[PDB]
Amino acid sequence: RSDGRKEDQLRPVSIQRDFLEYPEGSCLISFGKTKVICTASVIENVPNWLKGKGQGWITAEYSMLPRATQQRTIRESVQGRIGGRTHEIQRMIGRAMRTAVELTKIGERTIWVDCDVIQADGGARTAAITGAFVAVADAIIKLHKEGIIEETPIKDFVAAVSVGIVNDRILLDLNFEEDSAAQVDMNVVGTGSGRLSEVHTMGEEYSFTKDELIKMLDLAQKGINELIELQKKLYVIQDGKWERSELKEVSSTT
Amino acid sequence: RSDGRKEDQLRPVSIQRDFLEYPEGSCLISFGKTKVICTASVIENVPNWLKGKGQGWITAEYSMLPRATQQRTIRESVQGRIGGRTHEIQRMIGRAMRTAVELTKIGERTIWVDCDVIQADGGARTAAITGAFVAVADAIIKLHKEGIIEETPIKDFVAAVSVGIVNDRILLDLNFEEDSAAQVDMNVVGTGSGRLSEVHTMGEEYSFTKDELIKMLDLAQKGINELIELQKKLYVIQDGKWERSELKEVSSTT
Amino acid sequence: RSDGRKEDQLRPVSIQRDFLEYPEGSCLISFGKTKVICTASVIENVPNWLKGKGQGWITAEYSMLPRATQQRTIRESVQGRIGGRTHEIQRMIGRAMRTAVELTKIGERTIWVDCDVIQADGGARTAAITGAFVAVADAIIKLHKEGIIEETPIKDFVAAVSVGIVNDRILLDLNFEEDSAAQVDMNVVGTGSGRLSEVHTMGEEYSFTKDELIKMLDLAQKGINELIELQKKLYVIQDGKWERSELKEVSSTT
Amino acid sequence: RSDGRKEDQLRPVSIQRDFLEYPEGSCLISFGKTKVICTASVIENVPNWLKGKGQGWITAEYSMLPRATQQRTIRESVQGRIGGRTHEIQRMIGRAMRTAVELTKIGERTIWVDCDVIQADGGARTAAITGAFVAVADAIIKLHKEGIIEETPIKDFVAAVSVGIVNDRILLDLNFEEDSAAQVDMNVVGTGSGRLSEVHTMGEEYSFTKDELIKMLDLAQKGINELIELQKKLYVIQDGKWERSELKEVSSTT
Amino acid sequence: RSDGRKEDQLRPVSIQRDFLEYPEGSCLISFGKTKVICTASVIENVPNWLKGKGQGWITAEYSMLPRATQQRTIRESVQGRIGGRTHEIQRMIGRAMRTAVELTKIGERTIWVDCDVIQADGGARTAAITGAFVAVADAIIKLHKEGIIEETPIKDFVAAVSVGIVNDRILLDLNFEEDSAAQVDMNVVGTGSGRLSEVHTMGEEYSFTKDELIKMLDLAQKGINELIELQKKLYVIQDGKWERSELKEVSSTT
Amino acid sequence: RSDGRKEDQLRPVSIQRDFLEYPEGSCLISFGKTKVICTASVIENVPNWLKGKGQGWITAEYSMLPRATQQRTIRESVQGRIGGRTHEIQRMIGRAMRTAVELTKIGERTIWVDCDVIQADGGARTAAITGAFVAVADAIIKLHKEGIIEETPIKDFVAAVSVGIVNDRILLDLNFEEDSAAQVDMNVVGTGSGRLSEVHTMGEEYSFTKDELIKMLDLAQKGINELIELQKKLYVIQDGKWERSELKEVSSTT
Structure with missing residues (x-):
């Protein structure tokens, strides 16, 4: 690979929480040169079709x-x-956050997630989902610390990664050049317990086999796991009670 | 199931070619109550970034x-x-058509695919991809018959189907009610030789396992196969030379 | 004329009711190669400025x-x-439908008319008005059959046709070529009892006389009559009570 | 009538040329309280589809x-x-101006007509057509005076007026209240030699007869004539050569 | 200067009140060839965020x-x-009008100011502010005369003028050519008592000194004064009670 | 003041260059809690109206x-x-950058400045201008280092600051609360040699005196000076030749 990276190897990963002061939760995540600012801000209100139903909501905005x-x-x-x-991706990020949270226990308010790609080199949306989770959990923890809500109703960690076939090679976490030259590419959104929230595989004028898909899905799930092991160092969890750890930043050993 | 349908059973399928007179290729496809008009019209021109590169192009418009x-x-x-x-889907349909055609041999022109859902009951985009293929192949065959191009550069059949998990049941080809009530849903775009062009699986606030995905992907590929067996009755192909058969319409035995 | 048609002759006309299953009323009408799908769907609500005034409403959407x-x-x-x-035409179609219905007796709901031109060869908007009427009446009859309303408050049939002057020839129902080459063209919306709802005559860089207008208006009213004789075979009416006849389709003898 | 006006009587009409200094032609026309500024400005260029065809063009912008x-x-x-x-009306005004001018002899340039309703009380679009003509002719005369073109290729005067049926009364030139209360209303665009350029009659939930239309068209043509008699005092024409008269303003005797 | 004008000299100024009949206040103001129609119309309603707060509002629309x-x-x-x-300027005009009026005493209604530049030769926005004031005061006086409000809560006159540096020359009230060729240009909004409401100075790829700014601000304030002396002839004021004078028009001696 | 800050005191200022890797120039600037990412990226092309004129261009995008x-x-x-x-501000930032650069010597390319406010607490646009300069100079220096251009055609430093009157107090660099409560507020864009590029003062329903303006302009120019003293530590300049210093970050002593 162009950067001397193995085929089942993530680029250097860095996640920094408390990146900004105003949002209830915020971080700067980076997968190599791809950098995204992820903020979670609480709006004491709900979308019109949700009023009264004793539930909160999460929605995302993405910008490049x-x-x-x-x-x-x-x-x-x-x-x-x-x-x-842009809308495709905001919908994806919204779906990933809502799957990770028991909205029933958030109250009638909305967590507004903002993902801002300040530098892109492939994998921008997967970095955004991975980072947005950290901001949303921190925001929910912050809400708890403030007495706005009873518990920290987070169900599990959520991370994402890209994978693809380039010159019949299966690569994990593609940079921008590896992805423009890809025959088949994929994005996978996974959870802490090894389950999946989303998977999209697209042949780029090439078709693939059920088996090549599984091979890619296996390499992705391993990437998701490494990414979640990183997120995990940012929290101390017990019986569904979440607290932040003392780490303000976590990076990969690379 | 609400309509007495088995779990690995497609709804009644109907494909009618030559639905309209003006387009080079056109059909009315129906998956149950879901109905889509698919037309393929040839524009003697190419997108600005393709001029000169000795290649054609295919692009889609979707409307509901x-x-x-x-x-x-x-x-x-x-x-x-x-x-x-709408854009997400038009991009999908465009990608499915281009994968099925050797654009190199189409000349510098564009096949403009129009998918018009005149009635929706779930599976509208998968019906549109399945129908659009018939219109595009017919259009390429028409172009050949007119001497505009040398061969019929179609690589393979392309069809699509939806599948999902509803009350922990894995169902093929979901209607609108089965899909609003789904925990997990998926859309698969496959080819004649059993390969895949695209796959998107989304947990609807539920996560799923690698294994449940494979089970769904297996049920989809079987649906894709039945749909392609239907398309196949509309053509007579030999060594990459395509001709329409005498069927103006084909339906499923249900 | 290009198609061997007389000057006071409509192209082959075909009207097929119950074209689609979901709408309360629907049809596929065709004036030659011009084809329009017309659907009438009931929305249990009214435009904000009509709330409380004990009246219904009808509005149209047109797409090509x-x-x-x-x-x-x-x-x-x-x-x-x-x-x-597009808006000019939707306004026209809306005005034609409302003139034909006693909105007082429809209740506080709206009949949403959708006209979809799936193939155009001139006279698309007049075909749409002629077809939309069939869908609206069927929809009102359907509403009655369901007990949603007391009667079938339809005042009269409504149809439309184009006419123009081409090479100083006055022609009825122009195709696309006859209309691009026209010095003067016109669209007329008439009623069952021979009255008029709308008339627009436009000189295309040519002016015309009061007398040429009357000659055109006379040829149009005859076309409107033939079109309404066709619509009439689709209904059985008595003292303002409307029922559909057993015809699912009616065409012209040509 | 509310203002003591007869039924076949135009409101007080006033046309003032040279209203503004920059445009090649400009005027302030008024039909009662309805006031429109009409300017004709020359753009030394043509719409892309007209380049090379040895012809000019006229197009209008309308604002209220x-x-x-x-x-x-x-x-x-x-x-x-x-x-x-707004577009409906700009198209109308454009069609009226082009019918009055032999674009062949204008050169490859465009006369950009701007109609600005600064006060409305019904009949705004008909006042705009009547005024726009004065501005366009003045602009063509100005172009000639400057040697930009050989002749003054104006074919004839163009004026417009509204008419309608209110409480079964046929009234000429309707104010805003007479028109909101109208069962049927109409706009007619006529020429100097008594010919017609355009006619639109719309039943406002009422239908009308061929005969009522003719009665309205007769009252309109008389209004068009009076309006053109006024315009005529602004020019001195001979064998197709146009010059402005010394009048800077002309009004009706009322 | 191109027009023989001194450097500290305004172009010929003309302000005509009661330009139109419908608005509560209206005028046609002109700074040389720059002409703007300014109307003030009262809407018996307030912006949603102002409901209940016992206050009125003023807002502007600008069009060229x-x-x-x-x-x-x-x-x-x-x-x-x-x-x-356009928005920049409408915001400016809105701010100038609101500063001049004690909105507390206007009631819960809005004065909608419309500024329409019918001819531009530089200084269009400053002419619009100067004219808009006349229309707003007249409108407030009209409201009083009608008993809609108790007093005429106008705090002071408001006028505006442009100034700039051209070839190191400081000029007052720039026409369009003097302003395109300017190194530095400025717009100043002043009040009757010699105070300022707004000031914007922009170097056009040139920087300037605090002192050059003061020199420009001094020349502007003198222009503002002359313009306000003109406005003043249109009113008769005593202890905060405003009445129009008998002048329907006022112009500068030039 | 809320934060214990003097009246002629800037908040803590921090400027970090090389914030991102891809842009030719980039920084993260902060005035207290207000934070803006400023990037300068070079596009090897010019706006259509500048082609051929042997000159470059600079333009800005602002987002909050x-x-x-x-x-x-x-x-x-x-x-x-x-x-x-947003447009008002992008125009301002564009004008500030172009004034500081001799575009003649940049070649026919464009420096695309992106200002992204990631956190706002007042003074966001002035922080953006101050930061954008650093990114543009670095970008020009980078272009030189790469041989793309001969020199580093930067004319001078450019910085900006806000100032206003709050409870008749004149304050420098206002936070968001001090500015919403301001009677008069102002933004000043100055240069290294003490000159001015822009100044906008707006009374917020209050008027002010020539003298209060000068007092505010004096406090601003002092703020501009302190900000430029900071920028200066980032460069080593001699006879118009610019090089970056070894500082990657500079902050105020506060």
């Missing part, structure tokens, strides 16, 4: 500053049209 | 008339904003 | 799939801007 | 300042959506 | 008809995107 | 992530309309 892969990613303001690809 | 699932699906004109969910 | 006149008609989603020409 | 009928008419900037009703 | 500086200024309707420069 | 002042600042994508306030 104009310097994606060292090119240009002009937003939606001073540009024009509103592409539905 | 305002009577989806017997509710309301107001378009993008007399409504306002432009959701990025 | 991207294969209009065998060219390209990219919608409003994956294209951009929202032209005000 | 936020004080229409003493209510609120918030534009398209600090409001949002872009209604297709 | 397509003939700005004898070029093209296509609006926001039949053009597309919505630039945030 | 949804957690502004601990509230909600939903962007322009998954929200809708495009406010013209």
